[PDB]
A paper describes a structure:
PgDPP11 exhibits a strict substrate specificity for acidic residues (Asp/Glu) at the P1 position (NH2-P2-P1-P1’-P2’-…, where the P1-P1’ bond is the scissile bond), whereas PgDPP7 exhibits a broad substrate specificity for both aliphatic and aromatic residues at the P1 position. PgDPP11 is a homodimer, and each subunit contains a peptidase domain, including a double β-barrel fold that is characteristic of the chymotrypsin superfamily, as well as an unusual α-helical domain that regulates the exopeptidase activity of PgDPP11. Biochemical studies and crystal structure analyses revealed that Arg673 in the S1 subsite of PgDPP11 is a crucial residue for the strict Asp/Glu P1 specificity of PgDPP1123,27,31.
The crystal structure of PgDPP11 in complex with citrate and potassium ions was determined at a 1.50 Å resolution by analyzing a space-grown crystal. Two protomers of PgDPP11 are related by a crystallographic two-fold axis of the C2221 crystal and form a dimer. High-resolution diffraction data obtained from a space-grown crystal enabled us to identify two potassium ion-binding sites and two citrate ion-binding sites in the protomer of PgDPP11 because the present crystallization conditions contained 0.20 M tri-potassium citrate in the reservoir solution. In this study, the citrate ion was identified in the S1 subsite of PgDPP11, and the other was identified on the surface of the molecule and found to interact with the side chain of Arg536. A distal carboxy group (O3C5O4) of the citrate ion forms bifurcated salt bridges with the side chain of Arg673 (O4(citrate)–NE(Arg673): 2.8 Å and O3(citrate)–NH2(Arg673): 2.8 Å) and is found to mimic the binding mode of an acidic (Asp/Glu) side chain of the P1 residue of a substrate peptide. A water molecule that is hydrogen bonded to the central carboxy group (O5C6O6) of the citrate (O6(citrate)–O(HOH240): 2.9 Å) is accommodated in the oxyanion hole of PgDPP11 (N(Gly653)–O(HOH240): 2.9 Å and N(Ser655)–O(HOH240): 3.0 Å). In addition, a potassium ion was identified in the P2 residue-binding site of PgDPP11 and found to mimic the binding mode of the positively charged N-terminus of the P2 position of the substrate peptide. The other potassium ion was found at the bottom of the S1 subsite and appeared to be trapped by an electrostatic interaction with the side chain of Asp681. Comparison the binding mode of the citrate ion described above and a dipeptide docking model of PgDPP1127 indicates that the potassium ion, the carboxy group of citrate and the water molecule (HOH240) mimic the binding sites of the N-terminus, the acidic P1 side chain and the carbonyl group of the P1 residue of the bound peptide, respectively. The bound citrate ion, a potassium ion, and a water molecule in the S1 subsite of PgDPP11 were regarded to mimic the binding of an acidic amino acid and were utilized as a pharmacophore for an in silico inhibitor screening.
Numbering used by the authors: 22 to 720
Write the structure that this text describes.
Amino acid sequence: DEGMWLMQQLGRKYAQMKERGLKMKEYDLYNPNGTSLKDAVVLFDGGCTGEVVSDRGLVLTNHHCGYDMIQAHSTLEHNYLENGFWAMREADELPNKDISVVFIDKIEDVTDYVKKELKAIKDPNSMDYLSPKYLQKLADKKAGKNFSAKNPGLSVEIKAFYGGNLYLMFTKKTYTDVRLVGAPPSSIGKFGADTDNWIWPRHTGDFSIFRIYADKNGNPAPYSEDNVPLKPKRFFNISLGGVQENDYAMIMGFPGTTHRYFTASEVDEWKSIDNDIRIRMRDIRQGVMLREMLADPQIKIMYSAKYAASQNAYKRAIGANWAIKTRGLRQNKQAMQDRLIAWGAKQGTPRYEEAVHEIDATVAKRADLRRRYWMIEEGIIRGIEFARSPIPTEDETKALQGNDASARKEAIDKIRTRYSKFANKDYSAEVDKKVAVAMLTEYLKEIPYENLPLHLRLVKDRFAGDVQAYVDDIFARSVFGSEAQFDAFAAVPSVEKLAEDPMVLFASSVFDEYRKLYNELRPYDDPILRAQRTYIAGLLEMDGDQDQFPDANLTLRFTYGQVKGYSPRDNVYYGHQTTLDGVMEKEDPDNWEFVVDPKLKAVYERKDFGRYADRSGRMPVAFCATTHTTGGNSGSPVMNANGELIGLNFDRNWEGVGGDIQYLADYQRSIIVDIRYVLLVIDKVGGCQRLLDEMNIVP
Ligand SMILES: [K+]
Ligand SMILES: [K+]
């Protein structure tokens, strides 16, 4: 069901949750002064979500959330990324540099406090009401003198909600000794990762396992061998019961951003500028990279990760534009603004209509600048690798202006480091030239001569419109066009040559235009934010908050729904549950994405599923639910009707990515690893019994 709800809204939503099958008492899910399931949810390393699953501080999150830590501990001798990792005693769990988990110890509505303090600010158009520095000064004032000394590991933050109409203060408890305990092999953790990104059905065992360490009283402490596992106030019980179609499911976690209050004009702008440009420019870039990767196996090795990275937000933009085209997103926002405008007229209060018209007018005024910004960002800053070639600093240019040879040597050395990082082992000058010719052809079609970065005016003025000749000239003459050209430069460095370098002048020119567009566009954000404060206040006055969730803002939310598949297209149905049979159907030993771990294959051959399969002998892998998630919900716990852990959220289907603007009941799903499959992998693949024995596994 729709919405990413504040914990304060649990009372408002409880009747709807019970209608969908919730059996918990409200207090046990969230309460403000006691212990609740909210106390087992953590913010994992500043983006992801995770959950406490034992009375000794065991934490589950996704494999993709734990990846950087698994990779940091991996070597040729112990390649944990490929083999997995299973600590067979607590003393073998691996500490992690610069890691955190954050508990939300307390939440408080401070709206009246912040609105009182904002009365002091004289300028009615001040943006201090949304300023992180200003709200942190209010938090510090409220928490009082020596809050930190009186509360080990605790800190406070105030955040704005509903466009500045509501403020909450969070008291956060931060642990920095968080050790790696367990991870499946990447073949399981990343099964289908690029090909199946944003796809349901999905077959990925996307989990990893950490443990929170602390002092002997459970307070946060920096890494020490004297630290002991946290004895937490709440952990999740793990259900062996499984899921069935239509079962209630709920999620808690930290969704980052939504746009539920876009005007119709903002939907049109998101389609016609942001998404259309991203789709067109990435289709060009990807099409050239694919052609070069198919033709040369070494180019495939070098460019595979850059290609999949481009494809990530490409696929999301295609899904978002699909929803705008087919699912009525614009008309939904048109109806929302039309309803409030009709009500405002009945109330004798034109300020809501004025707010919608101010947003419309700002969107219309910025259209050509925003188009230019997205064209340069997708077409060149992201699109063309040599845009990020080195630019000598003034110090470096002075340094080899001079006759001090040793400062000169030091300037060349600094430049060499940036060149080596640019033209690294994954960089092909030939691929970059082909990509640049295709991307600049599009860019020069769309951006008129008078609005070009100055260096690009040389295509018309010096090369007679021949983009291939222009790009050929950059690489031919630049000291960064090849390793031999850089080495020749480093040997007899000419200050005149460097100031005239066509790659340096190209890079400088396109970053200059990008910067000047950014600076001219930024001011247009503020009138829309101020109008949204009014627009959202009207919507809330008119219809209340029960069916109007506040946009995500990196804070703790709950969502509820049911375990349920969907029909993507005519005569096609995707059910609610994938199985291990589906992993084996997808097995391809010559595609890294679809390798089946040999212990997992033997488990499947033997039907060695313990108590983790269904009664018919089918071993679950993933399920999907009608919960409302977005980026920031990776790793989130999935609870059944009784609050027991049934899975871990790890993705969303592409049909649902428009759901940041408008939830789609018949299309949007959260993609979740079944906890039964996590237990099977710990047991039969890791052989790590002590982790099963420390959990509370309930029927
Ligand atoms: K994804
Ligand atoms: K988002």
